[PDB]
Design a binder for this molecule. Structure first.
Ligand SMILES: COc1cccc2c1C(=O)c1c(O)c3c(c(O)c1C2=O)C[C@@](O)(C(C)=O)C[C@@H]3O[C@H]1C[C@H](N)[C@H](O)[C@H](C)O1
Lengths: 114, 111
């Protein structure tokens, strides 16, 4: 079928959460709240989905966590320096993909004239 | 990175087939040519992706060149494949807006 597959869906959630963190260190609750506001109430993530994703991100060295303060202590997550680098390299990589796509279209268009 | 290179090869391949039916060697050549020799797609990875896109009905395939004594597999982008590309663009656009909204709402809370 044509539906967005679970690998692309996971890639999409990833990008959103990594962009939340890129704006500022945040705790799970705050993160979910921010995404809900930014999706106009339509994307309200399950905290378990964040924990699943953060597990792997933390394991990969892309985010880390630390405790806030108190009435009660919060766990903050943060984009690491390698996280930030990764995001830049991914922007650049995919920007090159887009140029290759651009060129495939241009060559098709130009070879049709000729 | 593993999964993102595969995702990239996926997108590129879909785009070559959108440009017209093609076979595995031609796709790899065409992509290398569109990248000035810099992108060389892994044959192995093409086959793994093709196997999956065929199962999803996103691409189909047929034999060509039997009149020349050959037997070469060509791939084509199906209507399901066109839609998949539409939805990918639409869902990633949706992602972009949300991220744009995150930046603006952040900016609302600075001023
Ligand atoms: C159909 O395209 C895709 C299909 C499957 C997976 C993917 C994509 C895809 O397009 C894609 C991206 O475009 C980008 C990323 C990505 O993972 C994917 C896919 O996984 C990574 C990214 O979040 C970072 C860190 O820069 C942004 C980047 O988009 C770039 C270019 C866009 N035009 C936009 O400006 C965005 C903000 O940055």
């Amino acid at each position: 079928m044509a539906e967005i597959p679970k690998e692309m869906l996971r890639a999409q959630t990833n990008v959103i959460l990594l962009n939340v963190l890129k704006q500022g260190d945040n705790y799970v609750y705050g993160i979910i709240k921010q995404v809900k506001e930014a999706s106009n109430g339509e994307m309200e993530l399950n905290e378990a989905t964040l924990y699943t994703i953060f597990k792997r991100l933390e394991k990969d060295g892309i985010i880390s966590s630390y405790w806030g303060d108190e009435g009660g202590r919060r766990k903050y997550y943060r984009l690491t320096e390698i996280g930030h680098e990764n995001m830049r390299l991914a922007f650049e990589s995919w920007s090159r993909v887009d140029k290759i796509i651009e060129n495939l279209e241009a060559n098709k268009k130009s070879e049709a004239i000729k």
